[PDB]
Amino acid sequence: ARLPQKLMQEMKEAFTMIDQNRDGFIDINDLKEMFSSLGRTPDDKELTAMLKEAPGPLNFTMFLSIFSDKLSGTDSEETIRNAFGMFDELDTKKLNIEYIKDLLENMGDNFNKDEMRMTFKEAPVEGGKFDYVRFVAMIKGS
């Protein structure tokens, strides 16, 4: 079941950018380099620990093994927005809070009480309206 090609191309692109060496491996220097280009740079123990998650040297094939299962069934921001849009006929770009709660908890692959809690703790909701466009940005970002 997967993973789609586009996802492969993305991962390869990601791997390619992090490997500042063009070495074909990501090591601790590549990681420090990348993090420092983005903002705060985690301490060397955080970095080494990230690298430890890989059985061996961080080839692209090792990189794949680290990401594949966790990224397996994820979809683009666009796809997810349109998923939400299918419950938003008038294209208000919002969903009644009660409605998305009912869908998520009582239908499909029902969310349990903990899934519900973590889903909505920080969700953008106001005047009983769930901002799914903003929600989609959030689950893709940070």
């Binding site: 990601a14 950018m17 990224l71 299918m86 499909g108 969310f111």
Partner: protein
């Protein structure tokens, strides 16, 4: 007799309402199928997010994705 006539009229109407109930549900079918995929996308992606939002590899990954 007249009881029978009234009963058959009532059944005939009921059948027509049955035809209407059918129409309505069938009209809604395609959307019901699309919404199923939709909600699957939503539940699946929210679930993926809950797992990888505190994972340092992912936080990196998601900061790199926009630069691609």
């Amino acid at each position: 007799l007249e009881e029978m006539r009234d009963e058959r009229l009532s059944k005939i109407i009921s059948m027509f309402q049955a035809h209407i109930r059918g129409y309505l549900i069938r009209k809604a079918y395609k959307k019901l199928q699309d919404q199923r995929i939709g909600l699957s996308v939503i539940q699946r992606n929210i679930r993926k997010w809950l797992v990888l939002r505190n994972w340092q590899w992912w936080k990196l990954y998601a900061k790199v994705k926009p630069l691609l």
